C-alpha cells in the first residue's frame, strides 16, 4: 500500500539527515 | 584557533581532565561549528560521557539545534543509544526544553529512539515523562516508526505506556495485515486495537485488506475479535466484495468470508461486543472488576481462542 | 412486501395501538465499569 | 409454534428474567430472517443495561 511507501520515505529522510554530518 | 582545536581533540580522545581545565579558565562551552554542532553535539555523538557532564556544569546549552536538521545533542544520543549521556542532559535544568524538542521535520528524541529500537533509551524518555505520541510533520508518532522497522520490543514498551494503538484509524492492524505479520496482528488484537476503523483515504478496514491479500488467518482473527462483515469502503465494497474483485472461489479466505457475511453471528458474541464497547476497548482490565464467572470473563477477553 | 403473554409476518385470524417496525423489533443498574 | 412462544423453527436456534427472554426471542426471529439472505444484515440492538444478562442467557 502507498500508505507504507510514504512512511518509508519519511524514515529514509530521518536516516539520511541524522547521518548527514559525515556526508 | 589553537584552543578550539585542542579542546576538540581532548573530547575526541576522551581526555576529560583537559576539558575541565580550559572551562575553569573561561573557555565557553557554547560555540558552534559550520554544521551548528556544539561540544555537546560532538560529545554525545562520540559517546564521551565524562566530557558531557562537565560541559553542562559550565553552562553549555543543550537546547541548540544544528543547521542540518535542527537536531539537538539529545537527538544524536537517541540515535546511538547513549542513555547515560542522555540521562545527564535530562537531569539538567533544561529537561523540559529538550525532552520533546522537535527537529526541522518534527522528529522528537522519542521518534529517534523508537526508530532505532533503543529499548533503554525509550524507557529513559518515558521515565522522564516524554510525550508518548508526539506527531511528526507527516503526522507520524514514534510507535509507527517502531512498527515499520519492526522494533517489536519498543512496540511492546510504547503500547505499555499507552501509545495510541489505533493511530491513524487502525494503522497498526493495517500494517500487520499488509505484511501478513500474524504475530503482530494477534498481539494488537489481544491488546484491544479497534477493528472497525476505516483509513481516511480509501475507507478500507483491516478486514477489507485481509481480503485484498487472501489471508484467511488475518480475516479470521479480525472477525473473531469483531470486525464488521458489512462495513463498506469508499467504493462501496464490503470485505467479501473485495475478494470477489478477484473471484474464482476455491480459496479458504472467501469461503470463510462467505460463511460469516451471511449468517449473523451468535448472540453470545454480539453481547461480548457491546459490553466491550460499553466498557471501552482500551479499558478492558475493568472486566476483571465485573460480577461474572471466570469462564464468562475468559470468553470476554478472547483468552481461549 | 414483507396480557401476561405475547410474532409473525404479514387479518386478526389467530388460531393461538399496513395501516419499518422489523424482525429485530427491570434490567438492574449497569455496573460502574459500563457507565 | 410473562410468557411467549414462537415457530419451533424460529426457536430451532438454540419453559432467566423477562427483559432477557423478551429479546432472546427477538434474536431467534432476526437470526433466521437474515440467515442465508441476500441483503445487508442490520444491527441487532443490545441495550447496555440488559447486555450482561443477555450474554449469560445466550448459551446459543
Author numbering:
A (entry chain B): 1 to 23
B (entry chain A): 12 to 316
C (entry chain C): 1 to 2, 10 to 13, 15 to 18, 29 to 34, 47, 58 to 59, 65 to 66, 68 to 71, ...
D (entry chain D): 18, 27 to 39, 61, 65 to 109
Please share text taken word for word from the publication where this structure appeared.
ASB7 functions as the substrate receptor of CRL5 ubiquitin ligase complex, comprised of Elongin B, Elongin C, Cul5, and Rbx2 subunits. ASB7 contains eight ANK repeats followed by C-terminal BC and Cul5 boxes that mediate the Elongin B/C and Cul5 binding, respectively. ASB7 has been identified to target physiological substrate DDA3 for proteasomal degradation, and recent global protein stability (GPS) analysis unveiled its role in recognizing internal degrons of multiple substrates. Among them, ASB7, functions as a regulator of cytoskeletal organization, endoplasmic reticulum stress response, and cell division.
To investigate the recognition mode of degrons by ASB7, we determined the crystal structure of ASB7-Elongin B-Elongin C complex bound to a 23-residue peptide derived from LZTS1 substrate. The LZTS1-degron adopts an α-helical structure spanning ~5 turns over 18 residues, followed by an extended loop of terminal residues. The α-helical LZTS1-degron, extending from N terminus to C terminus, aligns in an antiparallel orientation against the ANK repeats from ANK6 to ANK3. Based on the structure, five residues E1-L5-E8-L12-L16 on the α-helical degron are almost entirely buried in the bottom of the groove, defining this region as contact site 1. By contrast, residues L2-M6-Q9-E13-R17 are associated with the solvent-exposed surface on one side of the groove, termed site 2, while residues L11 and K15 on the other side of the groove constitute site3. At site 1, two negatively charged residues E1 and E8 mediate the ASB7 bound through electrostatic bonds. First, the carboxyl group of E1 forms a salt bridge and hydrogen bond with the guanidine group of Arg185 from ANK6. Second, the carboxyl group of E8 engages three hydrogen bonds with the side chains of Thr151, Ser147 and Trp118. In addition, the nonpolar residues L5, L12 and L16 establish extensive hydrophobic interactions with ASB7. Site 1, containing five residues, serves as the primary binding site, where two negatively charged residues (E1 and E8) form multiple hydrogen bonds, and three nonpolar leucine residues form robust hydrophobic interactions with the bottom of the binding groove.
